[PDB]
Amino acid sequence: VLSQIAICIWVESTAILQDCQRALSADRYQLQVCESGEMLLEYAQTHRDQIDCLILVAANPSFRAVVQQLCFEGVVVPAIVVGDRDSEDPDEPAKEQLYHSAELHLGIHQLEQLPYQVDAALAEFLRLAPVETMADHIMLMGANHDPELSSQQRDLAQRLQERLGYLGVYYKRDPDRFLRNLPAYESQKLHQAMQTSYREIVLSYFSPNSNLNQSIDNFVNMAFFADVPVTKVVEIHMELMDEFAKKLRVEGRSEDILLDYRLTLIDVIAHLCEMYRRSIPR
Amino acid sequence: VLSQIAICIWVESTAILQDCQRALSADRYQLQVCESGEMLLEYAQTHRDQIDCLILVAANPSFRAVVQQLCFEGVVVPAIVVGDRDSEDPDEPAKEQLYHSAELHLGIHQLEQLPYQVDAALAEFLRLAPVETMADHIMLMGANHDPELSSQQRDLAQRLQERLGYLGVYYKRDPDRFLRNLPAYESQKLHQAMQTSYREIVLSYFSPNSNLNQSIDNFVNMAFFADVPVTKVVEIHMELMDEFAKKLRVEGRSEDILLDYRLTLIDVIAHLCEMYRRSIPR
Ligand SMILES: CC1=C(Br)C(=O)C(C(C)C)=C(Br)C1=O
Ligand SMILES: CC1=C(Br)C(=O)C(C(C)C)=C(Br)C1=O
Ligand SMILES: CC1=C(Br)C(=O)C(C(C)C)=C(Br)C1=O
Ligand SMILES: CC1=C(Br)C(=O)C(C(C)C)=C(Br)C1=O
């Protein structure tokens, strides 16, 4: 029970084309090949509601022009941009947005597992819609995009979600206790608690018989239910490494040993990851 | 408008009770305090369907006897055990499970974390229900519908989810394209592609201006949508580390720089974590 995926691709290199055709050989994928920018435009504006994912070679003649016209006509669909333009090393993935904010970037040699990248493009578009097109704007603002009616993106997304989404049950984490929603006092409090917990983890990490799994669980629970960005976990790890580095300096010990706790970090993050992963329904 | 949570706390210490009341002071938490084993057993029996979470102080008189009686009378609810039995000899970290398989352990100095750990305890119960009673199994199967009448649990579960669970849309990844479900040939192809990707990540990690982000995102996309566990990513990392070690040797270079690649691992796992974190709806 998985929907067909309507893929349209603007490609003018035969090698790239065949790479795509091979990767997307599964019956699930329906491929439209466009061999020129004008032909791509002609297909898009006449098949506006029949394109699930665009695959666009960035080096193709009049790329920015074609993309800009696409954005102006309101053809903003999930997309994979292959390579870059002949000045910024064409074979390699681009370092900035060319079409829109949910686009994926692939080098010409990262195409063998295209099914998974198509999954990623679709999902990311579904997550970010309405998407900031880096070709419709443009220096104006606005509030700061629009036509307010050009949010047919929403509609597209909705359509897509009927075919590529599925409902499932999740635990109602209280958004008021999310880190990003905490007032200063609470924020500071959670910060200190998480520091204390992580310090327990570090102190007992290399000790035998210490119930490591329990301390780690204690930290990870707070990280998960307060919806803490992984970077903040990293941040805590380093604040602790600083505390210990000062303690070691003062006591005349080498701080090199701190490198070992990189293994702790991995561990913790691993756990956090698996908590999110195993929480995905079905 | 938050769902009310019924907490029953068996505590015979003013300090502990105070910490609990302070941490769970919010209006959604409805606290019932039991100040003896008798009171706990009777309340638990007459209110078996009005307890969402138990909090049990492990140091309490005749603690084991009470928990065993809790099991005998069919009371199996989400739980947090606080401190250790003190019998010999800490008041903090409990090493073994003594009520059931879904219970959480909190130190008596960690009670300020209660709202998050209560969420964790409820969720962990919902995840493992019907849970494994400690005081019932000594074999590799007590357990399942022995007794059948302990479908109470399932009912409890379904009753909790209506107040603590919600429905949301998830992108439907293809299970047949998960790493573990692929035929060994497609499995090999995918493994190889992920190894290649990761090698790019390693080679370009400490290099300036390299498109490390696209590389990492590429890899992570493959890992997420093929639903690989973190152990698999670690596996890949080590397969690449062998290779690089071999190189560093037949070049005279020092291999204490392989240490630095732990950073890489962390990075990658972090990203994967974020990708899972971003995926939770609402
Ligand atoms: C907008 C635009 C134009 Br006019 C163009 O001529 C090219 C060529 C370098 C293929 C590219 Br690459 C491009 O993006
Ligand atoms: C002690 C304490 C901690 Br530690 C804490 O993390 C919070 C909220 C940020 C959940 C609150 Br409020 C609080 O009172
Ligand atoms: C600390 C402690 C120990 Br030593 C013990 O053996 C028991 C049994 C009566 C179950 C319980 Br009751 C208890 O709480
Ligand atoms: C630790 C670990 C976890 Br957690 C896991 O979910 C799996 C497979 C089910 C993908 C595997 Br294999 C594995 O090793």
Side-chain angles (χ1 to χ4, degrees):
Chain A
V1 200
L2 295 168
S3 159
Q4 280 215 133
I5 297 175
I7 297 177
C8 172
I9 164 180
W10 179 19
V11 65
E12 301 180 10
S13 160
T14 299
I16 301 183
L17 177 50
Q18 294 175 321
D19 284 346
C20 294
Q21 296 180 304
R22 181 182 195 214
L24 295 168
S25 96
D27 291 293
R28 186 181 181 188
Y29 307 110
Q30 300 302 325
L31 286 71
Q32 185 65 39
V33 186
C34 300
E35 309 178 347
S36 60
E38 193 55 79
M39 187 165 117
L40 169 75
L41 288 174
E42 194 170 39
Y43 183 77
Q45 307 186 23
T46 59
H47 291 62
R48 320 187 49 114
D49 302 333
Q50 288 174 269
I51 300 182
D52 299 329
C53 182
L54 266 176
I55 305 183
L56 302 179
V57 185
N60 296 349
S62 304
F63 184 77
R64 294 184 304 266
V66 170
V67 170
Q68 185 191 286
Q69 186 169 142
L70 284 185
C71 296
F72 266 72
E73 270 290 343
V75 183
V76 176
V77 300
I80 300 182
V81 174
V82 177
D84 207 340
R85 315 176 309 216
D86 63 326
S87 48
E88 336 289 349
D89 300 278
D91 295 11
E92 284 294 280
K95 293 180 182 177
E96 87 177 20
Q97 319 284 48
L98 298 179
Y99 178 19
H100 64 73
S101 70
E103 76 192 24
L104 259 67
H105 293 153
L106 287 173
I108 63 168
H109 294 106
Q110 306 179 293
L111 302 171
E112 289 195 52
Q113 306 299 329
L114 208 52
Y116 298 96
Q117 306 305 334
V118 167
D119 282 335
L122 293 170
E124 197 60 17
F125 180 83
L126 287 182
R127 207 179 53 89
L128 294 186
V131 151
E132 184 150 6
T133 59
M134 283 80 179
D136 178 73
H137 31 288
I138 191 66
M139 178 31 72
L140 268 200
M141 313 302 76
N144 68 355
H145 326 268
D146 285 7
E148 184 66 15
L149 202 137
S150 284
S151 289
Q152 60 224 18
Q153 284 202 39
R154 292 195 187 100
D155 294 326
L156 178 59
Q158 273 286 28
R159 184 151 35 82
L160 286 167
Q161 277 205 354
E162 156 63 16
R163 276 191 288 115
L164 304 172
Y166 77 96
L167 295 317
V169 174
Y170 210 89
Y171 186 85
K172 265 199 278 185
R173 291 183 296 169
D174 185 15
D176 285 325
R177 276 189 284 117
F178 285 173
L179 171 59
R180 62 182 176 276
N181 297 323
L182 297 175
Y185 174 75
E186 283 72 9
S187 188
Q188 170 96 357
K189 261 303 191 183
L190 176 64
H191 195 176
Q192 282 157 203
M194 296 190 72
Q195 278 177 340
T196 303
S197 187
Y198 199 89
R199 177 188 296 101
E200 274 296 297
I201 301 173
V202 165
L203 288 184
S204 77
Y205 191 82
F206 287 106
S207 294
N209 284 255
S210 63
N211 194 1
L212 193 63
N213 281 348
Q214 220 87 38
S215 56
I216 293 183
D217 279 343
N218 180 267
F219 182 89
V220 173
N221 288 346
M222 283 186 289
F224 176 87
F225 286 99
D227 197 29
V228 173
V230 182
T231 48
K232 318 277 189 177
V233 169
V234 176
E235 166 187 353
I236 292 159
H237 174 88
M238 283 282 134
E239 290 164 354
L240 267 303
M241 291 310 110
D242 292 341
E243 174 178 310
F244 285 146
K246 288 287 184 173
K247 180 175 158 64
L248 293 165
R249 279 194 196 91
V250 171
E251 296 174 14
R253 199 158 152 219
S254 171
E255 59 193 54
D256 283 331
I257 84 100
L258 299 188
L259 297 168
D260 310 21
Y261 295 113
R262 287 176 166 163
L263 293 196
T264 305
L265 187 50
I266 292 164
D267 215 325
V268 170
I269 298 179
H271 273 76
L272 186 48
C273 197
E274 288 298 344
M275 187 152 174
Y276 276 107
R277 177 171 180 259
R278 79 180 184 192
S279 73
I280 312 302
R282 172 171 316 284
Chain B
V1 79
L2 280 168
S3 170
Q4 286 186 348
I5 296 179
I7 311 277
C8 177
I9 315 168
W10 182 29
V11 53
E12 299 175 26
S13 158
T14 293
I16 301 178
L17 177 50
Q18 274 166 353
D19 286 342
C20 290
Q21 287 173 323
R22 177 74 176 271
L24 297 170
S25 71
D27 288 333
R28 81 178 290 196
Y29 304 106
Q30 319 202 90
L31 306 195
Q32 170 64 239
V33 183
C34 299
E35 324 198 13
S36 68
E38 288 195 34
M39 177 179 180
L40 168 66
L41 291 171
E42 180 171 335
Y43 177 81
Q45 169 263 313
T46 57
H47 294 73
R48 65 176 65 248
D49 302 328
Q50 292 166 64
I51 297 177
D52 296 322
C53 190
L54 274 180
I55 295 176
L56 303 176
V57 183
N60 291 348
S62 296
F63 182 84
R64 296 185 43 96
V66 171
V67 164
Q68 292 169 355
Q69 180 55 36
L70 227 44
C71 300
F72 198 77
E73 78 183 26
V75 176
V76 182
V77 302
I80 302 181
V81 174
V82 180
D84 199 29
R85 286 159 328 122
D86 287 349
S87 174
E88 252 148 69
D89 202 349
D91 54 44
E92 305 292 326
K95 193 189 73 65
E96 293 290 325
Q97 285 168 340
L98 46 71
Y99 179 23
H100 63 68
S101 64
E103 83 191 32
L104 262 73
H105 295 167
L106 260 195
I108 83 196
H109 301 315
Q110 301 179 297
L111 300 182
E112 69 198 80
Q113 315 171 356
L114 272 175
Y116 296 108
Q117 305 294 351
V118 158
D119 277 330
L122 292 165
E124 183 73 346
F125 181 90
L126 291 182
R127 187 181 75 87
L128 300 175
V131 310
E132 207 160 290
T133 42
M134 290 303 104
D136 270 337
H137 85 256
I138 71 185
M139 316 145 193
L140 278 296
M141 165 50 182
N144 187 19
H145 286 100
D146 283 18
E148 210 273 10
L149 314 150
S150 204
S151 279
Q152 202 90 356
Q153 297 215 41
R154 289 196 157 95
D155 291 28
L156 173 60
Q158 288 179 339
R159 207 156 39 78
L160 290 168
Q161 281 216 347
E162 290 170 36
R163 289 156 39 218
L164 301 163
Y166 71 103
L167 280 172
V169 195
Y170 305 80
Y171 185 92
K172 57 201 295 199
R173 302 175 292 173
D174 193 345
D176 294 321
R177 286 198 285 122
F178 289 168
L179 176 57
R180 62 182 175 272
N181 295 337
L182 290 170
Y185 171 79
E186 274 79 28
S187 185
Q188 184 272 304
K189 292 274 116 183
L190 182 50
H191 181 64
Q192 183 168 327
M194 296 181 71
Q195 289 189 287
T196 286
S197 186
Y198 197 88
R199 180 163 38 244
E200 292 175 36
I201 303 180
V202 170
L203 280 167
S204 62
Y205 197 73
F206 299 112
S207 310
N209 207 34
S210 62
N211 205 335
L212 182 60
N213 316 343
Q214 185 276 349
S215 195
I216 289 180
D217 290 340
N218 184 46
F219 183 86
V220 170
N221 278 335
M222 283 190 294
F224 171 87
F225 287 99
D227 195 35
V228 322
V230 176
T231 49
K232 269 290 175 181
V233 173
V234 169
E235 186 171 309
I236 291 163
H237 177 88
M238 279 166 54
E239 291 162 357
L240 272 297
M241 288 307 105
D242 289 348
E243 184 181 306
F244 277 68
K246 298 207 301 284
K247 186 178 185 178
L248 293 181
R249 292 190 274 256
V250 200
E251 253 174 31
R253 317 197 85 98
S254 177
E255 324 159 85
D256 294 335
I257 73 106
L258 275 192
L259 279 145
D260 290 287
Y261 288 112
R262 285 157 167 187
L263 285 71
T264 302
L265 183 46
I266 302 166
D267 225 318
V268 177
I269 299 179
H271 277 74
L272 189 56
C273 194
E274 268 304 312
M275 184 149 301
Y276 272 107
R277 175 177 171 259
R278 294 181 254 137
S279 70
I280 316 305
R282 283 217 69 78

